[PDB]
């Protein structure tokens, strides 16, 4: 026929951005699942690295094109909510862009396409809630089995027996019956060399990263102590202008010494008048933090001193302890402190790690520190990420109750239910909402491809069992075929799949909404 | 020396390129000549973009190495200083003489024969136009101000002024009457200070009988008005280059106090130096204080209790306008003060304009002065700057009208009558000038054709129309519809141009055309 000629073609910019963004998901789609294939990446510096992690590949890919850069923020938002499945969220976005590519070939404007995925995604979430099997936090048997089987993909398979309830109990202590977003950054994982995996403790108040006093008279332990965060530094007076001190005499040396010791003592006396048993000094390599002469003064006062506190802890220590930061000794008071039940230095095979319990504060809130012990560096490392992943599994169940059977089963069942619901619509609502269901089939397809199974065969077998049976039937790599994934203990929480289509619909929207790219300085 | 980078033009190629280059430069301001003429985007060397249709600004903005076009710039330079109105048309009229001269060169006519032809054609056209002029200031004097007011409305109709122009035309009339006496008939544009500020509306532009700046008093609690103070002599104003206070260094201070001795001394001195400098105002007997340097907080407080308003940091040129109007002087120090050096004026006050935070000040007289300050307002920057030059052009129009009472109508009516007279007398000369007079008549026809092209009219059809209406009936002036009035015959539409202004336009344009013909050789070297 004869229609709008479109002499200037801005569509070529949008079509090129979709193809370029789909090329990202083409490489990422093979890293999905435990059978996924690794990707080789050579950094500009010449370092050769390899891994299957989707969030790590997108970080080390050095992505330039802006539309492909957006998939990094999608994988980051996928990790910020669910914490797992950063590979699957990019795969789902690639298919929606691939489906929208066929939608643009039919003469459909991308604004209608963007709004079409909105009503399709918001309804797909409601369909997923219909098949979801609701659980409860009162049952700790399902919570441990969910965390234990999720850690079977991790370096320690057998030790997850004691690791699973630890991550469950750590969240349940700080989470009541009704809570939406439970912050996992409030749970601090402190790893220390030495000990074993069987030795692990969940400390209520907080745990520090450093020792206390290596000099003479170090208390190393205190009962009923008050703690505060010192951002100041105890040093003799150092004027920023040009200064010179010339000592040719023994009396001139003692004169400067006694004046400095008197200034350091006055700072130590004001701390003792504030009833401060334990002090935390911010780490400063610029100038001296606390002079050794001041350490001897605070040692006689029986005041525990802990220096070299990283700035990353300063923000967290003001949370769990419920105290206030101290900019200067003049603003340093008892009212800004905490009340600690016990402050001690735990030494396990030359460790000397310091832990604090009994915050006993009204400002206290869901903050818990966990001590991680181990011999090799690969132990305390993987164990930290093992719990961090297990903490996210519990957080998904607290925010949205219930879990779904994984293995590509929900992506097929939603695709089949929504396709039948699209037949009851009229006009545009019929055509595009069919393509959204076909884009959901990419997840079980890549699972069958990465596992060596036949693509067409396995999908038709699962589409066969979902008409009679239900979500329980899915892909299982352990059985090398199609079986019940609920009896195989493969369990994906509902928030992962809920935050998947949601962030995928927002990504495809933000892409199609970009009609051009112009250089602007 | 430096044979390289040297170009020379002589003989055949000289007479050609000189005319073609003059037509190319003039073609820019041809479309901009008229009330409906198209504007021009002019970018300053700093990158600022300005938009104006004035040919004098175009030639000044154009920076070029062409010596033939530099002669056109020198034409608008002398035309702006002598008149300041037809600068755009004097170059177009000269370009019409150059184009007709090129056609005569191709016929084998010597360049001097063309130059002598335009000279005799000019003197002939001056006498014919001098017989058709009329007098305004004759008979009733109120009738002169009536035509003088409506003559300013014509020059202000091509600008954004045209909205409120009824009030702005009165400002140009009241400005020339104040700085001029009927016997002297001398109009000095330096006596009328052109000044304007953004904000408010354009219709709030007024005319002050004295200097008006934009200044705020050094202290907010100072009184806004200054009275004559119960039978005193005028209002005494002080212009000094030194502040009233203990003196302080203007570069670095750093005064080291070695002992409490100097501390107790400088504490008592400087405290007493406060009142000693304030008493100097009463010693001179002055009311309003204006200084080049600021004051301390105590100086503003002591002048507050004594009712002595102070203004700080006034420009050197602004101090000169006050000294001329108020018969004052610029006093270097505080020891030279006297009562004969203070500015004498009737009233000084700070006048508030609506909600505007400017709150300017006015120094009045209440009798006719030798200088005034044109006050302009506007709702936008570019509107203010355009209104300043629009009134400045009106000041050039009212100047030539009072200087020469003989006036001639314009807008294309005068040039056609000048062309019809030369075309008839061209047959009686029977010389080489017969071709020069016909070309001179066709060159005069370029101006009404150019105005017709800018107004959306047929330049050929209008030219024959302007002639036919001036033949079958009478030689009386018949203008062009460029301003979109009811019909032709500007005499009913009151479009008036000065005869002395039109005579200098046809003269300098003819002289420049001859000087270009007098140059048969051009030698251009490099730039050292």
């Amino acid at each position: 026929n004869a229609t709008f000629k479109n002499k200037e073609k801005p569509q070529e910019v949008r079509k090129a951005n979709i193809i370029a963004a789909r090329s990202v998901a083409d490489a990422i789609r093979t890293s999905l699942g435990p059978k996924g294939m690794d990707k080789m990446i050579k950094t500009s510096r010449g370092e050769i690295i390899i891994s299957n992690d989707g969030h790590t590949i997108l970080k080390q890919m050095a992505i330039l094109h802006p539309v492909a850069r957006m998939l990094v923020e999608v994988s980051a938002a996928q990790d910020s909510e669910a914490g797992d499945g950063t590979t699957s969220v990019v795969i789902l976005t690639g298919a929606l862009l691939g489906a929208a590519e066929r939608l643009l070939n039919k003469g459909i404007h991308p604004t209608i396409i963007a709004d079409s995925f909105q009503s399709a995604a918001k309804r797909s979430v409601d369909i997923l809630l219909e098949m979801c099997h609701k659980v409860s936090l009162s049952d700790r048997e399902q919570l441990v089995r969910a965390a234990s089987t999720s850690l079977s993909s991790k370096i320690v398979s057998q030790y997850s027996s004691f690791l699973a309830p630890l991550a469950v109990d750590s969240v349940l202590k700080i989470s009541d019956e009704n809570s939406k977003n439970v912050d996992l950054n409030d749970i601090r994982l402190v790893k220390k060399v030495g000990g074993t995996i069987d030795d692990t403790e969940m400390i209520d108040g907080v745990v520090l990263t450093q020792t206390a006093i290596k000099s003479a008279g170090g208390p190393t332990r205190k009962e009923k102590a008050k703690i505060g965060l010192i951002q100041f530094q105890i040093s003799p007076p150092k004027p920023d202008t040009e200064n010179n001190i010339i000592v040719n005499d023994y009396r001139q040396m003692d004169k400067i010494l006694k004046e400095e010791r008197a200034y350091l003592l006055n700072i130590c006396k004001k701390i003792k008048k504030a009833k401060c048993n334990v002090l935390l000094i911010q780490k400063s390599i610029l100038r001296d933090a606390v002079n050794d002469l001041a350490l001897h003064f605070l040692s006689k006062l029986n005041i525990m001193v802990v220096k070299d506190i990283e700035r990353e802890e300063i923000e967290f220590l003001s949370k769990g302890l419920g105290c206030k930061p101290i900019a200067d000794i003049e603003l340093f008071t008892e009212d800004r402190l905490g009340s600690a039940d016990l402050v001690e230095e735990i030494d396990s095979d030359g460790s000397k790690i310091v832990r604090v319990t009994g915050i006993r504060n009204n400002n206290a809130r869901p903050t818990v520190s966990v001590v991680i012990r181990g011999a090799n560096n690969m132990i305390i490392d993987e164990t930290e990420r093992s719990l961090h992943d297990a903490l996210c599994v519990i957080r998904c169940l607290v925010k949205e109750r219930g879990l779904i059977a994984g293995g590509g089963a929900p992506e097929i069942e939603i695709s089949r239910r929504l396709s039948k619901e699209a037949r009851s619509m009229e006009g545009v609502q019929a055509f595009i909402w069919q393509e959204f269901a076909s884009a959901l089939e990419v997840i079980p397809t890549t699972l069958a491809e990465n596992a060596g199974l036949n693509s067409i065969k396995v999908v038709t077998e699962l589409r066969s069992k979902h008409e009679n049976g239900e979500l329980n039937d899915g892909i299982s790599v352990r059985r090398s075929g199609t079986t019940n994934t609920y009896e195989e203990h493969i369990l994906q929480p509902v928030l992962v799949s809920t935050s998947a289509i949601t962030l995928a619909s927002e990504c495809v929207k933000s892409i199609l909404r970009i009609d051009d790219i112009a250089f602007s300085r | 020396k430096d044979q390289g980078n040297k170009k020379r033009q002589h003989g055949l190629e000289a007479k050609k390129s000189h005319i073609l280059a003059a037509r190319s430069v003039a073609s820019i301001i041809k479309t901009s000549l008229g009330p409906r003429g198209l504007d021009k985007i002019l970018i300053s060397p700093d990158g600022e973009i300005t938009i104006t249709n004035d040919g004098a600004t175009i030639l000044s903005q154009m920076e070029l190495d062409n010596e033939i076009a530099k002669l056109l710039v020198q034409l608008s330079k002398s035309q702006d200083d002598e008149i300041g109105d037809g600068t755009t048309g004097v170059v177009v009229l000269a370009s019409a003489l150059l184009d007709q001269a090129l056609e005569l060169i191709q016929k084998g006519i010597h360049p001097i024969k063309i130059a002598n032809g335009f000279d005799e054609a000019a003197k002939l056209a001056i006498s014919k136009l001098e017989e058709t002029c009329d007098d305004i200031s004759a008979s009733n004097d109120e009738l002169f101000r009536d035509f003088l007011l409506r003559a300013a409305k014509t020059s202000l109709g091509s600008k954004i002024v045209s909205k409120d122009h009824d009030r702005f035309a009165e400002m140009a009339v009241e400005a020339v009457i104040n700085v001029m006496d009927k016997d002297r008939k001398d109009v000095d544009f330096d006596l009328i200070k052109m000044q304007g500020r953004v904000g408010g509306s354009i219709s709030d532009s007024k005319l002050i009988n004295g200097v008006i700046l934009d200044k705020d008093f050094s202290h907010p609690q100072m009184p806004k008005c200054v009275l004559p103070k119960e039978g005193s002599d005028g209002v005494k104003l002080a212009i000094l280059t030194c502040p009233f206070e203990p003196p302080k260094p203007k570069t670095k201070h750093k005064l080291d106090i070695s002992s409490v001795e100097e501390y107790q001394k400088l504490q008592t001195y400087e405290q007493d130096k406060f009142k000693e400098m304030i008493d100097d105002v009463k010693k001179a007997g002055a009311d309003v204080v204006i200084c080049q340097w600021g004051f301390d907080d105590e100086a503003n407080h002591l002048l507050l209790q004594n009712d002595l308003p102070a203004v700080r940091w006034v420009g050197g040129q602004e101090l000169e306008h006050i000294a001329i109007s108020t018969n004052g002087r610029i006093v270097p120090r505080f020891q030279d003060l006297s009562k004969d050096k203070l500015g004498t004026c009737s009233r000084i006050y700070e006048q508030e304009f609506g909600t505007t935070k400017d709150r300017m000040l006015i120094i009045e007289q209440s009798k006719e002065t030798k200088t005034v300050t044109c006050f302009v307002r506007g709702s936008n920057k570019m509107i203010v700057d355009e209104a300043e030059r629009a009134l400045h052009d009106s000041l050039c129009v009212v100047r030539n009208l009072v200087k020469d009472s003989r006036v001639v109508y314009g807008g294309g009516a005068a040039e056609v009558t000048m062309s019809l007279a030369v075309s008839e007398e061209a047959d009686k000369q029977r010389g080489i000038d017969q071709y020069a007079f016909r070309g001179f008549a066709q060159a005069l026809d370029t101006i009404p054709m150019t105005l017709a092209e800018n107004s959306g009219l047929d330049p050929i059809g209008t030219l024959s129309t302007l002639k036919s209406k001036q033949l079958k009936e009478k030689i009386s002036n018949i203008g062009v519809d460029c301003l979109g009035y009811g019909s032709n015959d500007m005499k009913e539409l009151f479009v008036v141009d000065p005869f002395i202004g039109k005579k200098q336009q046809i003269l300098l344009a003819t002289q420049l055309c001859r000087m270009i013909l007098k140059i048969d050789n051009v030698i251009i070297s490099g730039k050292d």
């Binding site: 370029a20 083409d26 080789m40 050769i48 050095a62 992505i63 330039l64 094109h65 492909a68 | -």
Partner: protein
């Protein structure tokens, strides 16, 4: 005979995927393995390993040859 010119997916480097890299992995490991195939066993023979300075050395030890073998491709 090479693999290059992706002509899409704007990036700060080359990208090779599919059967293209699968052939490069075979060709890379083949040339690296062909080095020690003649030195295997007691009947095997030694070879000269030249450095960048221009010196060299000769040994039949497979552990020494592979340690002094320069492999450009990461697959080898």
């Amino acid at each position: 005979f090479n693999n290059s010119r992706s002509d899409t997916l704007f990036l700060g480097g080359e990208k090779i995927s599919g059967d293209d890299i699968r052939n490069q992995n075979v060709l890379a490991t083949m040339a690296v393995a062909n080095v020690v195939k003649s030195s295997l066993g007691p009947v095997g023979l030694d070879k000269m390993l030249v450095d960048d300075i221009g010196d060299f050395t000769v040994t039949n030890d497979g552990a020494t040859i592979l340690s002094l073998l320069d492999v450009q491709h990461p697959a080898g």
